[PDB]
Design a protein around this ligand. Structure first.
Ligand SMILES: OC[C@H]1O[C@H](O[C@H]2O[C@H](CO)[C@@H](O)[C@H](O)[C@H]2O)[C@H](O)[C@@H](O)[C@@H]1O
Length: 432
């Protein structure tokens, strides 16, 4: 039988295998999809795909790409344009019922080179028992953290700032929210400091990074650039404010039921007995979920990502995965058909409700079962509709590495001179 390979991160290998097996039911034996797990590390994911692509591995068909790899894989000829679908359906399928944010990540040089399947956006997570109203902007985040420190309360702001992609993501969110951009749309010009308005945006972003780093009672993983997880800092009660991807929601509930969250003893609720399955995963009934969520709202809440400007909502950097057809495929028709099935409405419902991965289909955000399991659905939907996008460029890897090297450690940022250093390093990346 004909086999179509489907390379995805091992991180969610169970989920991506499940939707491929569901898809295999509807092909009538014409072909089958074989999911193949890439390493959990995204850096190693890209490297293995690159070796198979440059090595002309003719068994490589469909691949899930991080949303920042589009420009490189398209420019290299590694990802076929969706217009190469012999059935002529890939382009219309990728656009129909897909949220604008995810779609913007799948295009390069005015053509689609991938079909979004999963997405991601950061929210504010906070302790409502310690913080009365969630901060609406970064100035309020800083004031609240300082007030908590003066009161002897958890004062850290839990946010990923180590030298890496997460720090570039945070900077990009602040930059675009302030009205700036790393590169021009075509990715050919550096726009960090080329106009007064653009420079002001860059300086504003650097000021927020530096202010967070020097707030009283800040996270020492920031102020000393030690190791430390933002998720664990909040679950362990050391931070009352956190910005992070929505996977922390399920993590909070699961670990609280397992006794790992000292301020949220969900393990003490008798109605939650048996909600942990035989591999340690929280698998509640709908009633158990309602009980767990209601109890959690006393000490655990969510809110929109803090704005940069008081009256303008944040532009939050989008993440996720896009499905691409590799140039190495011997079966384009079936590869593009697999992509459509893997992202259809039922499989989008599956990856969200069963896999905890936010969907890209707009219709799902009106679905009642989705809304019950994602009570922050409205905030996610809004931030996916008006998202910030990291710079699209074939040299994104070098660009990100150089930006992170300048930004880190954020305690050493001097906004005015760091802005010029950022622009110079970005120019070097674009030049090669
Ligand atoms: O939220 C779970 C995912 O987190 C990572 O991906 C996000 O963070 C990256 C930056 O470190 C972004 O490049 C990416 O676009 C985001 O989706 C992790 O790499 C994923 O495997 C997780 O599913």
């Amino acid at each position: 039988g004909l086999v179509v390979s489907f390379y995805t991160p091992a991180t969610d290998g169970a989920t991506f295998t499940a939707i491929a097996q569901r898809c295999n039911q509807q092909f009538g034996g014409r072909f089958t999809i074989a999911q193949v797990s890439l390493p959990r590390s995204p850096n190693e994911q890209r490297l293995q795909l690159a070796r198979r692509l440059t090595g002309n591995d003719r068994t490589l068909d469909v691949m899930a790409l991080d949303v920042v790899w589009t420009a490189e894989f398209a420019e290299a000829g590694w990802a076929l344009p969706l217009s190469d679908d012999p059935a002529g359906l890939a382009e219309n399928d990728a656009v129909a019922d897909t949220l604008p944010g995810p779609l913007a990540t799948a295009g390069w040089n005015h053509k689609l080179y991938a079909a979004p399947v999963t997405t991601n956006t950061q929210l504010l997570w906070y302790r409502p028992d310690l913080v009365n109203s969630p901060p609406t902007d970064w100035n309020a985040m800083i004031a609240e953290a300082a007030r908590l420190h003066a009161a002897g309360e958890p004062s850290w702001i839990a946010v990923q700032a180590n030298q890496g992609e997460g720090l570039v993501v945070w900077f990009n969110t602040l930059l675009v929210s302030a009205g700036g951009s790393v590169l021009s749309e075509d990715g050919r010009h550096v726009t960090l400091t080329d106009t007064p308005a653009h420079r002001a945006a860059t300086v504003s972003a650097l000021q927020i990074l530096k202010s967070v780093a020097t707030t009283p009672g800040a996270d020492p993983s920031i102020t000393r650039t030690e190791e430390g997880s933002a998720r664990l800092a909040f679950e362990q009660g050391k931070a009352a404010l956190e910005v992070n991807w929505p996977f922390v929601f399920a993590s909070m509930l699961e670990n609280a039921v397992k006794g790992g969250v000292p301020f949220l003893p969900l393990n003490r609720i008798p109605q939650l007995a048996g909600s942990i399955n035989d591999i340690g995963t929280f698998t509640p009934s709908d009633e158990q979920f309602r009980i767990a969520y209601d109890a959690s709202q006393q000490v655990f809440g969510f809110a929109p990502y803090p704005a940069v400007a008081p009256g303008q909502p944040a532009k939050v950097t989008i993440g996720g995965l896009n499905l691409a057809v590799a140039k190495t495929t011997r079966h384009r028709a079936e590869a593009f058909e697999a992509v459509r099935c893997l992202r259809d409405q039922h499989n989008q419902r599956y990856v969200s409700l069963e896999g905890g991965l936010p969907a890209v289909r707009a219709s799902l955000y009106s679905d009642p079962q989705f809304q019950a399991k994602y009570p922050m659905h409205a905030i996610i939907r809004q931030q996916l509709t008006d998202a910030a996008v990291r710079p699209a460029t074939p040299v994104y890897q070098a660009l990100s590495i150089r930006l992170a090297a300048v930004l880190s450690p954020i305690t050493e940022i001097d906004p005015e001179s760091t802005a010029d250093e950022l622009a110079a390093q970005a120019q070097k990346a674009i030049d090669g």
